[PDB]
């Protein structure tokens, strides 16, 4: 049930500073009171991160990995689409969050031109449901499914890092209270490892999923969501582990 929207416009995009955001734990090794230098796919410090304010969600490139950030409380952003051609010719990855759990699902999705999570009232079991047939017309030959606790939860900035390296799709995340909406915050906050998924697919493009609900007064009227997208680069960082094992500082060795 793909919903063709008329008068679709490009989403407004400014360019903001990343400061020292986007750092994650590169391994699952506990280190206490050390200075550890690692060379990995990191978001460079003070880089141009694109800030995206009826608007389209752009199918952005994936490059070597994607830093994603969002400051919202409306729960419009529900997940992401990953793949190369985003049709039923090659495989694709879909991450969908709702109020109870997260579904991560690799199939041969035939995605809609405008994919969105449709929130609609269901009269038979008497509550608002969410339809995944609004994002894809059909999913076939589906090789991976994974249901876990949702990671789009609590003013609070949500940060994610997505990598697709040597057969594994790695997601890192962090949720932090912030007191400003125009920019990314200063300070420093390392992203803890969230999931390592044995996917093994080709990913060159991605697209954010937004939740659109019916007005009940086209028919889907919901507010636009703003998110920050930056790109990782192969880069050497020096991370500072304090006595409890937390990355409390880092220096970018090419800055």
């Amino acid at each position: 049930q793909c919903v063709n929207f008329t008068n679709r416009t490009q989403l407004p995009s400014a360019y903001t500073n990343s400061f020292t955001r986007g750092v994650y734990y590169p391994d699952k090794v506990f280190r206490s009171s050390v200075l550890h230098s690692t060379q990995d796919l990191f978001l460079p410090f003070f880089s141009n991160v694109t800030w995206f304010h009826r608007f389209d969600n752009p199918v952005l490139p994936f490059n070597d990995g994607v830093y994603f950030a969002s400051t919202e409380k409306s729960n419009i952003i529900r997940g992401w689409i990953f793949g190369t051609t985003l049709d039923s010719k090659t495989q694709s990855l879909l991450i969908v969050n709702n109020a109870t759990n997260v579904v991560i699902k690799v199939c041969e999705f035939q995605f809609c031109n405008y994919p969105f999570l449709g929130v609609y009232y269901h009269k038979n079991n008497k509550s608002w449901m969410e339809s995944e047939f609004r994002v894809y017309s059909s999913a076939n030959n589906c090789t991976f499914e994974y249901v876990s606790q949702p990671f789009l939860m609590d003013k609070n900035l949500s940060e994610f890092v997505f990598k697709n390296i040597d057969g594994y799709f790695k997601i890192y995340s962090k949720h932090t209270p912030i007191n400003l909406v125009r920019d990314l915050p200063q300070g420093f906050s390392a992203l803890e490892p969230l999931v390592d998924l044995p996917i093994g697919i080709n990913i060159t493009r991605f697209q954010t999923l937004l939740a659109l609900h019916r007005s009940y007064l086209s028919g889907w009227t919901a507010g636009a969501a703003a998110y920050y997208v930056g790109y990782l680069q192969p880069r050497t960082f020096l991370l500072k582990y304090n006595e409890n094992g937390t990355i409390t500082d880092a220096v970018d060795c090419a800055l």
Partner: antibody
Amino acid sequence: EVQLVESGAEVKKPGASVKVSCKVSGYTLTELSMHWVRQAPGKGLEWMGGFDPEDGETMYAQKFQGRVTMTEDTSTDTAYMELSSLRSEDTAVYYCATSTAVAGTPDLFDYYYGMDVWGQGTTVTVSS
Amino acid sequence: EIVMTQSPLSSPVTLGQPASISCRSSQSLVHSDGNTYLSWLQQRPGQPPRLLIYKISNRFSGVPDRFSGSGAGTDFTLKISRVEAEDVGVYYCTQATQFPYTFGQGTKVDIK
């Protein structure tokens, strides 16, 4: 916006089944309280029966009970209504109407009772 | 069963003169939620009826602004401000509060 299409007009020997269909588009059938209204020529239209959005599912008229059966196919988004034991008075036009089950957003929604979007009517004709 | 009486049974009116259509209910149409679910429908010859006004005075999506509704309790009025050629046909008042849903007898309005 909800758009409705109907089935063909039909004739029969009396004492058999009816299957009048009503396919919705734009809004899927689970978002819509669905009602069926009979209009006779030279008479005002009267309500046969339809969905109740809360404290039950379907409600019927008192004079049509034991005859009218309404069932909904979610896969095709098609509402079907049947009625057996055709009398000669029953020859009429059968309007299919619908409304949104609720009014509002997921935040602050309230139940809506109405008769909003009416499809065209199948012409049911009992004859020789 | 709630019966709707509708007055007058017919109304001949020329072009531009406003007209009023009365609807009376044997039972008070206030619901438990607070909204009194009354609707005014218009039917053209050869055409299925379409919704003009829902909930006394709220105008449906796409209806012109020369239609207005008023009234409360058991007494309701539909006012047409400027009669044009597109308004010929039958008008019905209906409720949606107590099952079964019922309709008025309908009034006929013409040009001349």
